[PDB]
Amino acid sequence: ARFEEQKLYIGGRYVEASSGATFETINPANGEVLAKVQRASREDVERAVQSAVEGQKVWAAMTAMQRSRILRRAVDILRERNDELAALETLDTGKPLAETRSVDIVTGADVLEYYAGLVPAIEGEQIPLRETSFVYTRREPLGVVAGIGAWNYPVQIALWKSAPALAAGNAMIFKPSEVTPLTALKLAEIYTEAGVPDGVFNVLTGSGREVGQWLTEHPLIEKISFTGGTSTGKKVMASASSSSLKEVTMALGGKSPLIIFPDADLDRAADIAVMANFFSSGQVCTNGTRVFIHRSQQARFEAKVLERVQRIRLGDPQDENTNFGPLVSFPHMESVLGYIESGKAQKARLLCGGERVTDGAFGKGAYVAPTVFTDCRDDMTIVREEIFGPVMSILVYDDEDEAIRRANDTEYGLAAGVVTQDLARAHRAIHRLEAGICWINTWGESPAEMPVGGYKQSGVGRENGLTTLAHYTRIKSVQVELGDYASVF
């Protein structure tokens, strides 16, 4: 393998798993074996919980500003090591260096930095009842929480989950995707180097159906935060609920609508649509994979999309000039190609792409060309179902209410956006769209201040923003009686 065997991270150091088993992590660009990685056993989970329990106490006993300084130091190290972490994330994900260097660690660290500053701002309430009684609330740490990560933005997700959890005084046990375990382990090292107490951020590697479930089932874990696909999230949430009634946050999939109204500048609209479909090779949960264009503008829009797609630079993710890499894995590629075949079979018109790229060195990896289908219909499989690949579906509409009705006609509801220059239309339409993440005249930006998450089957709870911090604490109400107590007995 390229790297030495990856071990569990428990108690501020690497420790040996006790399962006797390992798995491999593969570079999607060339099929290379990056590392053997240990599978945590059930007993290893137990060890991580007890470690977390004890570390959480040390961490909560500090002052708010002491925690803040430690998380800020972690931010400082992340900025220093951005490029090195990016290179590793590229190996592990297949995503272009041009993305990992500018987005993944940058925005992951942005959120850690945001919450680090907010630690001292976590406050309870005080309410007077009468002269002889008042109540005050405490926002106490939950204690030990678990994060379960997805493979498309490994370290960024580890950061978005751990930042609020640690800032609120918790310990987090994090399980990266079996598909992408490498950067999560580096994060844990960096937390320790920053002065995060032993046990406060532990990492367990392995599968979702095993280690994931052992975490969601454990009676001492008070909250689960999960990122991934909707069907998986239902299982995770059921398990977290029936085991011990955990609090849960779910960031799931979607089939987000992008509505281009007739007064839109078509260049901006095309720029938005491509960015909404082909960043990270189309492997972004919030992608605008149903693009609605007015009948009167279909041809010109298509021409603009085509021009942009034809100049997309698919290639070796190691090459800085690349802006479009392979998919995360061969099995994911096969899934995407199946959707592409479905699109052809159901008679959607292929505007461009539609196949795997195998020329030269690309045969070694899992490269699917940026793909655009048009003349789509709402009942098509590619229009209804999340593909999580570089596959745009263009849909013609005739009026605004129709476009909106159709955009809303889905069990998903993660994101939505509109392109228009009209003041009234922009807000009116966005207010009617049933999604948690709404963009006007742009797409994809997810500022640390902005709470993000899904409506409907696209999520439970939110991430980022002030409010999320609050959801990593639990409220204790304390009523102080200063007067007499009356009994009816």
Ligand X SMILES: NC(=O)C1=CN([C@@H]2O[C@H](COP(=O)(O)OP(=O)(O)OC[C@H]3O[C@@H](n4cnc5c(N)ncnc54)[C@H](OP(=O)(O)O)[C@@H]3O)[C@@H](O)[C@H]2O)C=CC1
Task: Write out the binding residues for ligand X, residues 370-409 only, by CB under 6 A.
Answer: none
Q: Which stretch binds K ion (CB under 5 A): 245-253, 366-374, 376-384, 395-403?
A: 245-253
Of 174, 339, 455, 472, the one binding a second copy by CB under 8 A: 455
Of 39, 101, 161, 175, the one binding ligand X by CB under 6 A: 175
User: Does residue 25 touch K ion according to CB under 5 A?
Assistant: yes
CB of 459: closest distance to a second copy in angstroms? 7
Q: Are strands 201-203 and 290-294 parallel, antiparallel or unpaired?
A: unpaired
One-letter amino acid of 54: E
User: Does residue 213 touch ligand X according to CB under 6 A?
Assistant: yes
Q: 484 vs 13, 132, 380, 467, 480, CA distance in Å?
A: 55, 8, 70, 38, 11
One-letter amino acid of 34: L
Residue 64 sits at the vertex; the CA angle it makes with 472 and 163, to the nearest 5 degrees, is 40
In the complex with ligand X, which residue's Cβ is closer, 10 or 376? 10
How many angstroms separate the CA atoms of 340 and 414, rounded?
23
Radius of gyration of the chain (CA): 24
178 touches, from a second copy, K ion, ligand X, none (C-beta below 5 to 8 Å by class): ligand X
92 touches, from ligand X, K ion, a second copy, none (C-beta below 5 to 8 Å by class): K ion
With CA atoms as reference, report the closest residue to 389 among 257, 291, 252, 283.
283
Q: Which of residues 75-104 bind a second copy (CB under 8 A)?
A: 98
Strand partners, 113: none
In the complex with a second copy, which residue's Cβ is closer, 246 or 356? 246
Q: 215 vs 35, 212, 398, 422, CA distance in Å?
A: 24, 5, 49, 49
In the block, which residue shows the tokens 């078509």?
266
Q: Which of residues 234-263 bind ligand X (CB under 6 A)?
A: 235-236
Describe the strand order of the beta sheet including 459-460 as a list of residue ranges.
Answer: 14-15, 8-9, 201-203, 171-175, 144-148, 223-227, 247-251, 459-460
User: Does residue 321 touch a second copy according to CB under 8 A?
Assistant: no
338 touches, from ligand X, K ion, a second copy, none (C-beta below 5 to 8 Å by class): none
User: Does residue 105 touch a second copy according to CB under 8 A?
Assistant: no
In the complex with a second copy, which residue's Cβ is closer, 157 or 250? 250
Of 2, 21, 43, 126, the one binding a second copy by CB under 8 A: 126
User: Does residue 219 touch a second copy according to CB under 8 A?
Assistant: yes
Of 168, 237, 328, 391, the one binding a second copy by CB under 8 A: 237
User: Does residue 475 touch a second copy according to CB under 8 A?
Assistant: yes
250 touches, from K ion, ligand X, a second copy, none (C-beta below 5 to 8 Å by class): a second copy
Can you read off the two tokens belonging to residue 463? 């991430």
229 touches, from K ion, ligand X, a second copy, none (C-beta below 5 to 8 Å by class): ligand X
User: Does residue 150 touch ligand X according to CB under 6 A?
Assistant: yes
Burial of 46 (0-12, 13-18, 19+ CB in 10 A): middle
49 touches, from a second copy, ligand X, K ion, none (C-beta below 5 to 8 Å by class): none
237 touches, from a second copy, ligand X, K ion, none (C-beta below 5 to 8 Å by class): a second copy
User: Does residue 39 touch ligand X according to CB under 6 A?
Assistant: no
User: Does residue 227 touch a second copy according to CB under 8 A?
Assistant: no
Of 92, 99, 178, 316, the one binding ligand X by CB under 6 A: 178
Can you read off the two tokens belonging to residue 476? 């204790």
- Residue 314: DSSP 8-state: B
**E-strand spans in 209-296?**
223-227, 247-251, 257-260, 290-294
Can you read off the two tokens belonging to residue 483? 């007067």
Can you read off the two tokens belonging to residue 106? 């940058």
User: Does residue 97 touch ligand X according to CB under 6 A?
Assistant: no
CB of 227: closest distance to a second copy in angstroms? 14
Spatial neighbors of 481 by CB under 8 A, at least 6 apart, are 132, 133
Q: Are strands 247-251 and 459-460 parallel, antiparallel or unpaired?
A: antiparallel
User: Does residue 287 touch K ion according to CB under 5 A?
Assistant: no
How far from chain centre, in Å, is Cα 361?
30
Q: Which stretch binds K ion (CB under 5 A): 237-245, 314-322, 424-432, 445-453?
A: 237-245
Of 9, 191, 201, 279, the one binding a second copy by CB under 8 A: 279
Q: If DSSP codes are grouped into helix, strand and coil, which group holds residue 310?
A: helix
In the complex with K ion, which residue's Cβ is closer, 92 or 110? 92
- Binding residues for ligand X, rule: CB under 6 A, are 148-150, 175, 177-179, 207-209, 212-213, 216, 228-229, 232, 235-236
